[PDB]
Amino acid sequence: MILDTDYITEDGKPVIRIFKKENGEFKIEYDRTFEPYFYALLKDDSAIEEVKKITAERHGTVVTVKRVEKVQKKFLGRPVEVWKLYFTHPQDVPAIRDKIREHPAVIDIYEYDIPFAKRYLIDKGLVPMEGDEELKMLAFAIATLYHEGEEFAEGPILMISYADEEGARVITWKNVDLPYVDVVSTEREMIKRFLRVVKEKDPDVLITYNGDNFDFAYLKKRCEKLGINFALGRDGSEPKIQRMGDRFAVEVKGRIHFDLYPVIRRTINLPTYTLEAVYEAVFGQPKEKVYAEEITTAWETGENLERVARYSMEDAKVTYELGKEFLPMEAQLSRLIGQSLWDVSRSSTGNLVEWFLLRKAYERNELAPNKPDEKELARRRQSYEGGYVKEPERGLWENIVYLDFRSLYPSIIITHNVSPDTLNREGCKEYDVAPQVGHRFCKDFPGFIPSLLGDLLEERQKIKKKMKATIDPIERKLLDYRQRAIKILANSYYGYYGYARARWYCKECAESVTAWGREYITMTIKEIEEKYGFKVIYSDTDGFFATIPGADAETVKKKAMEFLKYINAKLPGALELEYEGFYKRGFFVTKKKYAVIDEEGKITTRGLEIVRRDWSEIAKETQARVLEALLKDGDVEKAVRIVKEVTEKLSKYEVPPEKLVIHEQITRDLKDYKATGPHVAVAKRLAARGVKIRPGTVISYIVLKGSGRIGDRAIPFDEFDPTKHKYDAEYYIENQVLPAVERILRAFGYRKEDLR
DNA sequence: TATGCAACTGTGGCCGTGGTC
DNA sequence: GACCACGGCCAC
Ligand SMILES: Nc1ncnc2c1ncn2[C@H]1C[C@H](O)[C@@H](COP(=O)(O)OP(=O)(O)OP(=O)(O)O)O1
Ligand SMILES: [Mg+2]
Ligand SMILES: [Mg+2]
Ligand SMILES: [Mn+2]
Ligand SMILES: [Mn+2]
Ligand SMILES: [Mn+2]
Ligand SMILES: [Mn+2]
User: Fold this and answer.
1) For residue A190, what are the CA distances in angstroms to A51, A182, A286, A309?
2) Residues with Cβ < 8 Å from A717, sequence gap 6 or more?
3) Which has the least CB within 10 A, A184, A244, A257, A518?
4) Cα(A520)–Cα(A542) distance, rounded to whole angstroms?
5) What homologous superfamily is domain A137-345 in, according to CATH?
6) Which atom belonging to ligand 1 lies closest to the Cα atom of A409?
7) d(Cα A339, Cα A332) in Å, to the nearest integer?
């Protein structure tokens, strides 16, 4: 299989490198013949003689057109002949593309900003990660000597651990008497030993957890201090640390550096993304955490270094196990998109949409539209109407069915052929007309995007059918993550239409999808209520909760299935309402905030404070206990006792101050805020000390006893001292606990006074 | 800023916070 | 006290 591609330059000429693993052997294929190019549409074919003469310069070098070729293509499905302009080196294209666009005989130019090594995959029809080849994988981790107030990596790496199918080991330069610990003389020999291990094992994949942003950079600084050629690359190169906007990423040439952290952070919703928390969530088994401050004391004192080495060994071990489970999911994405796992595992959904479209366009002989210029961008800043959200019938409900459209917006796109190559296209026999916004879509031929979505949705549904019939709970969870990844990808084709930077931008298509969605969901609601005597309790965009008031569970379930048969026969094309579940009880607080309990006692909560990372633990804990008392038991009196226990304890300062921390992310430079909330107030004070606040910095603060603005008396929790600071019990009662639970316990007649 | 030097699919909604009047 | 923009996070 193909692992990756890049290109280097030799004597001015590009050379594509294809990193392969075939029949158990690593290979680099060199392609010295593939040429960069872009396309020009000319006012007349005679003008090619001038265009071929155009020259530019780049750093001393004269840039010329190498050769040209007339080709017949389509643009949004309409046939057109263009000239394919070939050049000697990819960097010729930026240097000359504008001088060609500006030539008076050139109408427009296309496909002039495509990364060369990825262009190569598309045009050659090559897909990374195909085949039955078994890849060799190795995970690693490091333990470091940390002291507060030091520059990054000023202290040495203490241990390097690594794990694979054969087991896990730790390399260190202090004597530790564990069987899996290899002792060497110095930090330098440790690093060199690890380098030797990687070269001997020769893994196809190197697995880290946040190695993109810590492990490799730490190793780099140390290797700069120590004079080490850290030649992990299969071509003898060192890890390449690249900046991609606000964070970094690391390549090891000839291998795939698989950093789990961006994958997990995108797939699993967790309050914290420690390795321990991620391991427990996936496997159900605990992992002890040894903190940076314990690591340093153990090393300086020499006492209890076994515990550090075990912790280091386990980091590698679980990093490996996690990588074993998540690499196959990302490898499927890599094949679906047609790009390397390194890139696919680190990209936003929209970037994957566009790489997929660019490949499908190439296969269909469709020119890509260009990205917008600054003027076109500014023209694309208007919004448009989205999904319909019904105000809920607040309160407790019983015997509730949840019905929900399968992949609604993609299904609309498929059914109504919604696409920029079919919008208001004149001369067709057949059109579908979007409600409210009126855009007309030709139905006589499949639009480009509509014709691609069907295979995605069909693949998702297969994964789902397998997932629901899977006994192993871990394999089922991984199948869930996989079918969810395709759901988000397919919906991102819709969002792409309304995405200002998209090539296949189509705001008319975007708002037609949403308009059809609004029409379908409201039609389904009117139908189930009028023809089946259901009451719709709550509805959001394409699904709703309903019951038959007075009816038992058996009856509600029977009639719901009858409705589905009826309504799915009326719906067109790919549109399908699905039975998503039954809930014996449910509590609806507001739009987007509710909780339901299934017939097995499992509670699911949406939007409520329990699921919010920026509410205090004590508030979330209390609300969770309340909802369990209400929905699982029938004990409203117990729910209130819980609340009073909490307000009493908080008053008596019996609640552990750790449950009172508020976490809120900084999203911009501190100068760009217009209002200063508590987390910005704390962040500005930390900046004044020189701490360095960035977008993505999380402020974890606690509110101290006082009366004025909350940000005036808010401190970071790492500065809290119970011997000096009293937390603001009245604030956590009146501003965290009571608000979250009172919104539920109103429905039973409980005022705030009845709970404190 | 990646031989990918700008910045990461879309809209709807709650609600504490700190302003205004 | 009534009201309102902001901001962060969340549900689709
Ligand atoms: N991440 C998203 N990006 C864009 N649009 C979205 C996103 N999530 C939801 N929507 C839109 C498109 C969805 O089709 C629609 C309804 O959401 P939802 O029911 O969650 O998903 P779905 O109908 O695509 O999948 P499912 O088959 O799991 O119901 O709202
Ligand atoms: Mg690459
Ligand atoms: Mg839905
Ligand atoms: Mn659904
Ligand atoms: Mn749906
Ligand atoms: Mn807040
Ligand atoms: Mn806002």
Assistant:
1) 59, 9, 29, 14
2) A657, A658, A661, A700, A701, A702
3) A244
4) 8
5) Ribonuclease H-like superfamily/Ribonuclease H (3.30.420.10)
6) 14
7) 11
Counting atoms of ligand 1 from 1, which one is nearest the CA of A408? 14
Count of other CB atoms within 10 angstroms of residue A641: 13
Task: Answer for A387: CB within 7 Å of strand C.
Answer: yes
Fold that domain A609-754 belongs to in CATH:
Topoisomerase I; Chain A, domain 4 (1.10.132)
Residue located via tokens 């090891």: A252
Experimental method: X-ray
Amino acid, single-letter form, for residue A130: E
CA of A677 to C1' of B16 (A): 10
Q: What six digits make up the tokens of A131?
A: 């085949």
Length of chain A: 756
Residue A350 CB coordination number (10 Å): 16
In this structure, are strands A440-442 and A157-164 parallel, antiparallel, or unpaired? unpaired
Distance A533 CA to B13 C1' (A): 29
CA distance A53 to A60: 18
Residue A71 dihedral angles phi and psi, to the nearest 5°: -140, 150
Distance between Cα A694 and ligand 7 center (Å): 20
CATH value of A2-124 in 3.30.70.141, 3.30.342.10, 2.30.30.140, 3.90.190.20 = 3.30.342.10
Determine if ligand 1 sits within 6 Å of the CB of residue A389: no
